[PDB]
Amino acid sequence: SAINVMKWKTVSTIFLVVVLYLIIGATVFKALEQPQEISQRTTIVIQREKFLRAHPCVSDQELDELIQQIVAADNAGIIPLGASSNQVSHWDLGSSFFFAGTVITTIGFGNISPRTEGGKIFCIIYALLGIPLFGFLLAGVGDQLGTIFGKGIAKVEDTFIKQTKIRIISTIIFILFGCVLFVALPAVIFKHIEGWSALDAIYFVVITLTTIGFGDYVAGGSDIDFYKPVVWFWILVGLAYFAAVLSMIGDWLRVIAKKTKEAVGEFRAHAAE
Amino acid sequence: KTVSTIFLVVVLYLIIGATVFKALEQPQEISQRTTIVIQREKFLRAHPCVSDQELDELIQQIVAADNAGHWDLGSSFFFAGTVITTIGFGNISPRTEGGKIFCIIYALLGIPLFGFLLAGVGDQLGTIFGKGIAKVEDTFKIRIISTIIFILFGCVLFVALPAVIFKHIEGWSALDAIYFVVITLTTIGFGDYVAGGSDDFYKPVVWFWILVGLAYFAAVLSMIGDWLRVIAKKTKEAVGEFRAHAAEWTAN
Ligand SMILES: CCCCCCCCCCCC
Ligand SMILES: CCCCCCCCCCCC
Ligand SMILES: CCCCCCCCCCCC
Ligand SMILES: CCCCCCCC
Ligand SMILES: CCCCCCCC
Ligand SMILES: CCCCCCCC
Ligand SMILES: CCCCCC
Ligand SMILES: CCCCC
């Protein structure tokens, strides 16, 4: 029980650190997003009134009700228009493959989701069984890429031999060339093909490879066949790379935390001599 | 390259999943699209005020509206939690360039930090369990019995009760409830169902649950991976047996 007390102490401290991290993030996010939210809400009410007064026809609750039915279609995509009344399949051959990949990688873009009860129960079991299997594949791809690196890093460190300070150089080259291969090039290719901006491109890259997946940006969701498989294969390899990067960042965080712990101890003991 | 063989396994898993998903979803898709065209014509004929060209403009502004409509005091906190947990429901996402760059750095730094918190909560809950499970196992294939009890009581506490509480408070069905539970606690988070969306003691409990349930689901998924590895090492020797016997027979 001696170590359990210290363990609970550490866990509580981490908990509070994360809570305050969330508080800071929430403040920054609301202070960065609520202004445009209010602008959009006021302009949307403006256009609502403009269309209501121009067509005071019977609607009102029918109008909000129509936007509500529009909302249900919206999630699956409201695509009802006089031109192009023929639609495309969000569940065609490759789309369901795309969806299964999102499910197993726990990305879950959500741009397309199952509506059938059977579809939902399936997706449940399919995830419960695929997440670990895909974990195995990911760990393997990780190992493979790590050895592919170790080879080239043993090649690159021999030339720089003109121990304790060489690992810094190797990690620098690792992060550099990785951000090149798994962040820069795919982001530029997306900017081109998908028509995104540089920001949007790198932001989609990061949100995908971190397994967050918001859904705002998807490489295979717009109606704009060698691109999609390469994108998914990237997603896999980039996921391995980002696992490595996040592990390094966590190591750095632990180092900084245990450094500031002794810093605070120092400050407490001295109190200005 | 054992991993390459697994790669083919996973690709085949994806193909099977894709077939099942399309055969489970494309019918409802066609039904919904036909009913949507029906309702389009119905709304046009019921209101000859709105013309063919007038409806398209509203549906276009609505599509633009879907990207926007939030960000209140607690909503941004919930969003930060989704970001750090890699859930990413997406119901609310940053639109500002500054918001996007922030969210990027915020995730890159919170994901590992939250990982530390999660590992701590995990260890703690694992020991909390170990106490009672060693107490019952001393009195009592025994690891099999214990794992059964673990999975049972875990599904109870972190799946059943929260799913029923959601069914009640949020107005969902039993299926939808368990489906949201699983999609959240697997860190998938599609966005179709959100507990703190669709607009102050419910939401904080929801997030703290999310945390504890995530620990529980990590444990469950690791166990499932162990079972998969066991079954794989069983079928490897099964295939070895079969090949050795087919060869013994082909000798004759
Ligand atoms: C070593 C090759 C470097 C080529 C420089 C490419 C610059 C193109 C601009 C890319 C961002 C739009
Ligand atoms: C859930 C559907 C996946 C079934 C995969 C087939 C199982 C055998 C894989 C190949 C064995 C050599
Ligand atoms: C119901 C499916 C159970 C097995 C799923 C795939 C694992 C089978 C063996 C895979 C490696 C040979
Ligand atoms: C965001 C930096 C927090 C530093 C905390 C130091 C000890 C609570
Ligand atoms: C501010 C809410 C006014 C009512 C809006 C109802 C949906 C159009
Ligand atoms: C557009 C520049 C993004 C830099 C991200 C910073 C990550 C530490
Ligand atoms: C479903 C195949 C399992 C075989 C176990 C020996
Ligand atoms: C923004 C009002 C709540 C502060 C604790």
Ligand SMILES: [K+]
């Ligand atoms: K997601």
Ligand SMILES: [K+]
């Ligand atoms: K995830």
Ligand SMILES: [K+]
């Ligand atoms: K999502």
Ligand SMILES: [K+]
């Ligand atoms: K994860």
Ligand SMILES: [K+]
């Ligand atoms: K996710």
